[PDB]
């Protein structure tokens, strides 16, 4: 229940909360693995003569 600025009475409401998850396999196979793989070269260049 709430009370708004317009009026004196109280107004009811129903709040529906959806808690959902994202299936991770797609973005972990096409987005994070390429960058995590190419981030392993920033230290490699120092060993190059």
């Amino acid at each position: 229940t709430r009370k708004y600025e317009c009026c004196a009475e109280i107004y009811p409401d129903i709040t529906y909360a959806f808690v959902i998850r994202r299936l991770p396999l797609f973005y972990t196979i096409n987005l994070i693995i390429p960058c995590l793989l190419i981030s392993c070269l920033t230290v490699l260049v120092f060993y190059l003569p």
Partner: protein
């Protein structure tokens, strides 16, 4: 005829639920076969075309100094193809398209190739005066050489042969 998509069969079946005793519906099933030629020419030819360079980079000699350019160009192009083929496939984590799987595998292969190439390039330009380390390497690699079916044979030349 619509062009791309071709219909195979159009079955229709009436679904009755014995539990509800009221739910009734008619389900039509469309089994559709994509014509391959378009996506074939657009993706498969370039993908199989550029994937040879990953295993080709090793035949390149180290003295010229072109291993890094080749390998980085291949890896960048391969990541580009991966992102492009991921943009067209629907983002569903239920399964992986086999092309993307093979491409990620060859990407792991080429990113192992880059590190082994930088390692061989480092052991190549090594000077004879700084890192002598002869006896541990001499016997082992001169025994291994005939087992590799490679032609048999001033220290810098020996280091280059080792590389």
């Amino acid at each position: 005829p619509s062009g791309e998509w071709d219909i195979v069969a159009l079955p229709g079946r009436r679904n009755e639920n014995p539990d509800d005793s009221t739910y009734v519906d008619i389900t039509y099933d469309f089994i559709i076969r994509r014509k391959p030629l378009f996506y074939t020419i657009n993706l498969i030819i370039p993908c199989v075309l550029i994937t040879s360079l990953a295993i080709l980079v090793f035949y390149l000699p180290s003295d010229c100094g072109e291993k890094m350019t080749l390998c980085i160009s291949v890896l960048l192009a391969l990541t580009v193809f991966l992102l492009l083929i991921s943009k067209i496939v629907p983002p569903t984590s239920l399964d992986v398209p086999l092309v993307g799987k093979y491409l990620m595998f060859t990407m792991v292969l080429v990113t192992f190739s880059i590190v082994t190439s930088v390692c061989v390039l480092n052991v190549h330009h090594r000077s004879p005066t700084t890192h002598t380390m002869a006896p541990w390497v001499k016997v082992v690699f001169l025994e291994k050489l005939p087992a590799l079916l490679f032609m048999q044979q001033s220290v810098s030349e020996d280091w280059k042969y080792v590389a």
